[PDB]
Amino acid sequence: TRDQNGTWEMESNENFEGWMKALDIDFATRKIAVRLTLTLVIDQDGDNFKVKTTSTFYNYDVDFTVGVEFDEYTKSLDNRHVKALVTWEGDVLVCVQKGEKENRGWKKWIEGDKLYLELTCGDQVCRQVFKKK
Protein backbone atom coordinates (compact mmCIF):
# COMPACT_ATOMS: atom_id res chain seq x y z
CA THR A 1 0.00 0.00 0.00
CA ARG A 2 0.99 3.63 -0.54
CA ASP A 3 -0.83 4.74 2.63
CA GLN A 4 1.79 5.76 5.18
CA ASN A 5 -0.51 7.80 7.41
CA GLY A 6 -0.09 7.17 11.09
CA THR A 7 1.94 7.44 14.24
CA TRP A 8 4.85 5.05 13.96
CA GLU A 9 7.04 3.83 16.81
CA MET A 10 10.54 2.50 16.18
CA GLU A 11 11.19 -1.19 16.92
CA SER A 12 14.51 -1.72 15.11
CA ASN A 13 17.36 0.52 13.92
CA GLU A 14 20.24 -0.95 11.94
CA ASN A 15 23.50 0.96 11.21
CA PHE A 16 22.18 4.34 12.41
CA GLU A 17 25.71 5.18 13.55
CA GLY A 18 27.32 4.43 10.19
CA TRP A 19 24.75 6.56 8.40
CA MET A 20 25.14 9.54 10.75
CA LYS A 21 28.91 9.28 10.43
CA ALA A 22 28.60 9.29 6.62
CA LEU A 23 26.66 12.57 6.94
CA ASP A 24 29.42 13.97 9.20
CA ILE A 25 27.07 14.49 12.14
CA ASP A 26 29.34 15.50 15.00
CA PHE A 27 30.64 12.75 17.32
CA ALA A 28 28.92 14.12 20.42
CA THR A 29 25.45 14.42 18.85
CA ARG A 30 25.76 10.88 17.55
CA LYS A 31 26.40 9.53 21.06
CA ILE A 32 23.10 11.02 22.23
CA ALA A 33 21.01 10.02 19.23
CA VAL A 34 22.23 6.58 18.19
CA ARG A 35 19.98 4.50 20.48
CA LEU A 36 17.01 6.84 20.92
CA THR A 37 13.61 5.38 20.14
CA LEU A 38 12.17 7.43 17.30
CA THR A 39 8.53 8.18 16.54
CA LEU A 40 7.36 9.25 13.08
CA VAL A 41 4.08 11.06 12.69
CA ILE A 42 2.97 11.07 9.05
CA ASP A 43 0.06 13.07 7.68
CA GLN A 44 -0.52 12.16 4.04
CA ASP A 45 -3.20 13.68 1.82
CA GLY A 46 -2.75 12.97 -1.85
CA ASP A 47 0.75 14.19 -2.70
CA ASN A 48 1.02 16.36 0.35
CA PHE A 49 3.08 14.98 3.21
CA LYS A 50 3.86 16.39 6.61
CA VAL A 51 6.37 14.20 8.45
CA LYS A 52 7.35 14.82 12.10
CA THR A 53 10.27 12.85 13.54
CA THR A 54 10.32 13.00 17.32
CA SER A 55 12.46 11.64 20.13
CA THR A 56 13.19 12.64 23.72
CA PHE A 57 15.82 15.19 22.72
CA TYR A 58 15.39 15.84 19.01
CA ASN A 59 12.36 16.93 17.02
CA TYR A 60 12.41 17.36 13.25
CA ASP A 61 9.77 18.31 10.69
CA VAL A 62 9.66 18.20 6.90
CA ASP A 63 6.80 18.95 4.53
CA PHE A 64 6.85 18.04 0.86
CA THR A 65 4.70 17.32 -2.15
CA VAL A 66 5.33 14.13 -4.09
CA GLY A 67 6.60 15.03 -7.56
CA VAL A 68 7.71 18.57 -6.73
CA GLU A 69 11.41 19.29 -6.34
CA PHE A 70 12.29 21.37 -3.28
CA ASP A 71 15.52 22.98 -2.13
CA GLU A 72 16.37 21.91 1.39
CA TYR A 73 18.79 23.24 3.93
CA THR A 74 19.47 20.42 6.36
CA LYS A 75 19.46 22.62 9.41
CA SER A 76 20.29 20.79 12.64
CA LEU A 77 21.24 17.64 10.75
CA ASP A 78 24.41 18.16 8.71
CA ASN A 79 23.88 21.80 7.63
CA ARG A 80 23.99 21.32 3.86
CA HIS A 81 22.05 22.49 0.81
CA VAL A 82 20.45 19.74 -1.25
CA LYS A 83 17.83 19.51 -3.97
CA ALA A 84 15.17 17.06 -2.80
CA LEU A 85 12.61 15.12 -4.80
CA VAL A 86 10.18 12.52 -3.46
CA THR A 87 8.47 10.18 -5.91
CA TRP A 88 6.76 6.77 -6.05
CA GLU A 89 8.38 3.65 -7.44
CA GLY A 90 5.47 1.25 -7.16
CA ASP A 91 4.46 1.41 -3.51
CA VAL A 92 7.95 2.54 -2.40
CA LEU A 93 8.29 6.24 -1.59
CA VAL A 94 11.71 7.36 -2.76
CA CYS A 95 13.56 10.50 -1.83
CA VAL A 96 16.69 11.67 -3.64
CA GLN A 97 18.66 14.58 -2.14
CA LYS A 98 21.08 15.81 -4.82
CA GLY A 99 24.17 17.59 -3.55
CA GLU A 100 27.61 16.90 -2.13
CA LYS A 101 26.94 13.44 -0.72
CA GLU A 102 26.44 10.60 -3.16
CA ASN A 103 23.56 8.16 -2.87
CA ARG A 104 21.85 10.47 -0.40
CA GLY A 105 18.17 10.03 0.33
CA TRP A 106 15.75 7.47 1.64
CA LYS A 107 13.08 4.94 0.78
CA LYS A 108 9.94 4.30 2.85
CA TRP A 109 7.39 1.50 2.40
CA ILE A 110 4.76 -0.50 4.25
CA GLU A 111 4.69 -4.23 4.91
CA GLY A 112 1.64 -5.31 6.84
CA ASP A 113 1.43 -3.35 10.06
CA LYS A 114 4.98 -2.04 9.72
CA LEU A 115 6.71 0.96 8.18
CA TYR A 116 10.20 0.44 6.80
CA LEU A 117 12.69 3.23 6.30
CA GLU A 118 15.98 2.91 4.51
CA LEU A 119 18.34 5.91 4.86
CA THR A 120 21.31 6.15 2.52
CA CYS A 121 24.42 8.28 2.37
CA GLY A 122 27.59 7.39 0.51
CA ASP A 123 28.23 3.68 1.00
CA GLN A 124 26.16 3.49 4.19
CA VAL A 125 22.65 2.15 4.55
CA CYS A 126 20.59 2.49 7.74
CA ARG A 127 17.43 0.37 8.05
CA GLN A 128 14.66 1.26 10.50
CA VAL A 129 11.41 -0.54 11.26
CA PHE A 130 8.35 1.00 12.91
CA LYS A 131 5.11 -0.41 14.25
CA LYS A 132 1.85 1.51 14.02
CA LYS A 133 0.84 2.97 17.38
Ligand X SMILES: *C/C=C(C)/C=C/C=C(C)/C=C/C1=C(C)CCCC1(C)C
Question: Cα 55 from chain centroid?
Answer: 14
Parallel/antiparallel/unpaired status of strands 92-98 and 105-111: antiparallel
Fill in the amino acid letter for 87.
T
Contact 85, 69 (CB under 8 A): yes
Does residue number 55 form part of the binding site for ligand X (CB under 6 A)? yes
Closer CB to ligand X, 50 or 102, in the complex: 50
Closer CB to ligand X, 64 or 123, in the complex: 64
Residues 15, 39, 44, 53: which binds ligand X (CB under 6 A)? Answer: 53
Does residue number 51 form part of the binding site for ligand X (CB under 6 A)? yes
Report the distance separating Cα 5 and Cα 20, nearest Å.
26
Q: How many CB atoms lie within 10 A of CB 108?
A: 22
Greatest pairwise CA separation for the chain in angstroms: 39
Closer CB to ligand X, 56 or 102, in the complex: 56
Residues 79-108 touching ligand X, rule: CB under 6 A, are 106, 108
Residues 4-43 touching ligand X, rule: CB under 6 A, are 20, 25, 33, 36
Q: Using CB under 6 A, which of the segments 7-15, 56-64, 65-73, 96-104 binds ligand X?
A: 56-64
Would the CA dihedral through 100, 55, 107, 91 be positive or negative? negative
Residues that bind ligand X (CB under 6 A): 20, 25, 33, 36, 51, 53, 55, 58, 60, 62, 77, 106, 108, 117
